[PDB]
Amino acid sequence: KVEYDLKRLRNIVIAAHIDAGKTTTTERILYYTGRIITAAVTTCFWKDHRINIIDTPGHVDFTIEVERSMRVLDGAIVVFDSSQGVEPQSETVWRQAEKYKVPRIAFANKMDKTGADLWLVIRTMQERLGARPVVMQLPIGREDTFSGIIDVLRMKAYTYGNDLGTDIREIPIPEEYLDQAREYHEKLVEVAADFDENIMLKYLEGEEPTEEELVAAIRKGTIDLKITPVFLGSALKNKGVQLLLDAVVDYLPSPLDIPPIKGTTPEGEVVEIHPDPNGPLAALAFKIMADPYVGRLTFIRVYSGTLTSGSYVYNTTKGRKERVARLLRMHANHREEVEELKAGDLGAVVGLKETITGDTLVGEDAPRVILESIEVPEPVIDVAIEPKTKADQEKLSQALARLAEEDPTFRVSTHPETGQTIISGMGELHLEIIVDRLKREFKVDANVGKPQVAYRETITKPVDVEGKFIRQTGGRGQYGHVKIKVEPLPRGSGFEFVNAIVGGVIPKEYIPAVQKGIEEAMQSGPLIGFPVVDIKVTLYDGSYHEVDSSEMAFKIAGSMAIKEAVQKGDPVILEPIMRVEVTTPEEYMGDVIGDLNARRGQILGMEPRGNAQVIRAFVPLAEMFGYATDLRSKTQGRGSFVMFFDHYQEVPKQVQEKLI
């Protein structure tokens, strides 16, 4: 309730370059829809349509929380600062909106400000974005006298008594603006004829289209990604935001309007999931929020069926039932408990202990589908962290072995030499965000480090070696003696320990101890100090002493054998051969072609999209540290990229020997 209808849903995101007015716009929209922050989806009502506003924290738009977020939204409002029109970053959200295929309208904000110019937005949408903007509105007045808005679709005008959002009036268009309005109204009809036959047979014949035909035609052209209708105003001075809301219901898609999502069955079939509220239940968890009134709050989008309060669902990623205790929607100022969330909709569930973000939720006796591929992409960027004193070290762990319940993609450790904390993400950007999600969100006044990569080490030759630790030490003898064979495993397989000891040759008691010694020595390779992988260790012989043998003793002997196996094993360096997706204006095609090659790369194939290009690439993350402000140095602040893991390769000859 209000009575759910799919055609009246409107799932949107507000996207924008930093400082353009994303938050102000959101906030005024929550003010205007509430007459009658935190939350990952806030819901509201306008005319008779539910608007679900999806939050997308992203001071930069490059990461991996925006391949999930863009599967969960249907439409978007792109907000330009009007003094600039498009900036770098406007350019780059346009690219993602284009790549994932999401209908959008533009809001030229800050029309009250000094510099503001409708036309620079539009001209700069045409040139640099290839957008096909259509002028839906003209401004009455300039900067400090900006005072009214003309709807060129309907040939009506609005004036604003004040800056409080509290006195709006429908006027006939001032005489001194009429010819400009008629100019841009006829441009609108011309655009409308390219998506509707009947409008074309009216234009030729000298006839005004009904406003409903026009709305329907611009709607159709918007949703099939052909035009971007542009509105303006000032969210700060409260003009135009109620007409922006009217444009959300007129032009932005319901869940009926975009192609259904695709999921995978365990039997491998890629399948379309239709937005049918009475089909089986399929849903995505897209964000987990430690919430301070009900606790763990998992936000979901329903794609199919109906999720019900106090029913069970089955998490196909994990392998387990979970009770949905409660269902909530978040409004601007309040929470609302609801009995159900149906196809097309978003909300939060309470209950749910082991569902983390990206997990698919299904019926219980519903077809087990997966919506996001099974994979935790490897942790490939380590980092040093000084918190400072004992009111920091003790309370940094407070929100790391607690804060990972929200993002469990990352890991934490402690270098084999330096007794400290090391943090591990999956790309330069991924980690830029995490240290200062914490000094702020946990009042940890603490010391910044700089980031390193995560190579590995392994052998390429079966060896046979030994490890003795024999020492008078601590006013007693220590004796431990192991013999191991160590063998390459195929890349990826990980670790294997085989115990082939014959009859007390090493006492059992101590065979765990040797194992402990091997994994601890495995943390540090000989070439370059990094962890060893993809080996089969086989303990086949050794000896002991009747009083002097100990666990400590056999632990070090195991460390020493494995240390020595790796050095004697024709060792070798594994680097992460990882995958970019460099978007770039066609003009700088060759410039980032040859820059990505002077950081080691075999280019996989570049395909064209929009008024630009998409150079997918192989590049070891090591020679890409700080690619953000090097790509946007060689592409005039119009490039983007998106980065991730793919596999581990043996570095060729010279590469080995640069690292030492």
Ligand X SMILES: Nc1nc2c(ncn2[C@@H]2O[C@H](COP(=O)(O)OP(=O)(O)O)[C@@H](O)[C@H]2O)c(=O)[nH]1
Footprint on this chain of ligand X (rule: CB under 6 A): 16, 18-24, 109-110, 112-113, 234-237
Q: Which stretch binds Mg ion (CB under 5 A): 14-22, 151-159, 331-339, 534-542?
A: 14-22
Q: Say whether 422 counts as a known binding-site residue.
A: no
Residue placing its CB nearer to ligand X in the complex, 23 or 611:
23
Q: Say whether 58 counts as a known binding-site residue.
A: yes
Residue placing its CB nearer to ligand X in the complex, 139 or 488:
139
Residue bearing tokens 């140095």? 633
Amino acid (1-letter code) at residue 476: R
Size of the site for Mg ion (CB under 5 A): 2
Sign of CA pseudo-dihedral 639, 644, 647, 651: positive
Q: Say whether 179 counts as a known binding-site residue.
A: no
Minimum distance from CB of 25 to ligand X (Å)?
7
Minimum distance from CB of 27 to ligand X (Å)?
7
Q: Find, among 266, 254, 274, 259, the residue nearest to 100 by Cα.
A: 259
Q: Say whether 112 counts as a known binding-site residue.
A: yes
Residue bearing tokens 């400082």? 19
Which residue has its beta carbon closest to Mg ion? 23
Q: Say whether 194 counts as a known binding-site residue.
A: no
Answer yes or no: are the C-beta atoms of 296 and 355 closer than 8 Å: no
Choose among ligand X, Mg ion, none what residue 20 binds, the Cβ cut-off being 5 to 8 Å by kind: ligand X
Residue placing its CB nearer to ligand X in the complex, 163 or 407:
163
Minimum distance from CB of 22 to Mg ion (Å)?
5
Minimum distance from CB of 56 to ligand X (Å)?
11
Minimum distance from CB of 247 to ligand X (Å)?
17
Amino acid (1-letter code) at residue 412: V
Q: Find, among 15, 14, 242, 240, the residue nearest to 111 by Cα.
A: 240
Q: What angle do CA 5, 336, 405 make, to 5 degrees?
A: 105
Neighbours of 311 (CB within 10 A): 14
Q: Say whether 330 counts as a known binding-site residue.
A: no
Choose among Mg ion, ligand X, none what residue 235 binds, the Cβ cut-off being 5 to 8 Å by kind: ligand X
Q: Find, among 130, 12, 9, 152, the residue nearest to 70 by Cα.
A: 12
Choose among ligand X, Mg ion, none what residue 113 binds, the Cβ cut-off being 5 to 8 Å by kind: ligand X
Q: Find, among 306, 322, 255, the residue nearest to 72 by Cα.
A: 255
Residue placing its CB nearer to Mg ion in the complex, 8 or 437:
437
Task: Indicate which single residue of 4, 6, 23, 527 sits in contact with Mg ion (rule: CB under 5 A).
Answer: 23
Within the chain, how many helices (H) and strands (E) appear? Answer: 14, 35
Residue placing its CB nearer to Mg ion in the complex, 15 or 330:
15
Phi/psi at 114 (nearest 5 deg)?
A: -90, 125
Helix (H, G, I), strand (E, B) or coil at 115: coil
Tally the C-alpha atoms within 13 A of residue 229's C-alpha that lie toward its C-beta.
Answer: 36
Q: Say whether 639 counts as a known binding-site residue.
A: no
Choose among ligand X, Mg ion, none what residue 374 binds, the Cβ cut-off being 5 to 8 Å by kind: none
Distances (CA, A) of 465 to 5, 48, 374, 505, 528: 72, 76, 39, 17, 21
Minimum distance from CB of 109 to ligand X (Å)?
5
Length of the chain: 660
Minimum distance from CB of 239 to Mg ion (Å)?
20
Q: Say whether 606 counts as a known binding-site residue.
A: no
Minimum distance from CB of 93 to ligand X (Å)?
11
Q: Does residue 24 interact with Mg ion by CB under 5 A?
A: no
CA–CA distance, 271 with 650 (Å, rounded to integer):
37
Q: Say whether 17 counts as a known binding-site residue.
A: yes
Q: Say whether 110 counts as a known binding-site residue.
A: yes
Neighbours of 461 (CB within 10 A): 12
CA–CA distance, 63 with 644 (Å, rounded to integer):
9
| 187, containing H or E segment | helix 178-193
Residue placing its CB nearer to Mg ion in the complex, 17 or 22:
22
Answer yes or no: are the C-beta atoms of 461 and 569 closer than 8 Å: yes
Choose among ligand X, Mg ion, none what residue 19 binds, the Cβ cut-off being 5 to 8 Å by kind: ligand X
Residue placing its CB nearer to ligand X in the complex, 242 or 315:
242
Q: Say whether 21 counts as a known binding-site residue.
A: yes
Could you list the beta-strand ranges (E) of 276-333: 282-289, 297-304, 306-308, 312-315, 320-330
Residue placing its CB nearer to ligand X in the complex, 16 or 371:
16
Q: Say whether 22 counts as a known binding-site residue.
A: yes
Choose among Mg ion, ligand X, none what residue 68 binds, the Cβ cut-off being 5 to 8 Å by kind: none
Residue placing its CB nearer to Mg ion in the complex, 15 or 122:
15
Minimum distance from CB of 173 to ligand X (Å)?
23
Distances (CA, A) of 319 to 281, 322, 358, 405: 16, 10, 14, 18
Minimum distance from CB of 649 to Mg ion (Å)?
41
Choose among ligand X, Mg ion, none what residue 110 binds, the Cβ cut-off being 5 to 8 Å by kind: ligand X
Residue placing its CB nearer to ligand X in the complex, 12 or 236:
236
CA dihedral 81→82→87→91, nearest 10 degrees, is: 90
Choose among Mg ion, ligand X, none what residue 43 binds, the Cβ cut-off being 5 to 8 Å by kind: none
Q: Say whether 49 counts as a known binding-site residue.
A: no
Residue bearing tokens 């770098």? 88
Helix (H, G, I), strand (E, B) or coil at 313: strand
Binding site for Mg ion (CB under 5 A): 22-23
Annotated binding site: 16-23, 55-59, 109-112
Annotated binding site for GTP: 16-23, 55-59, 109-112
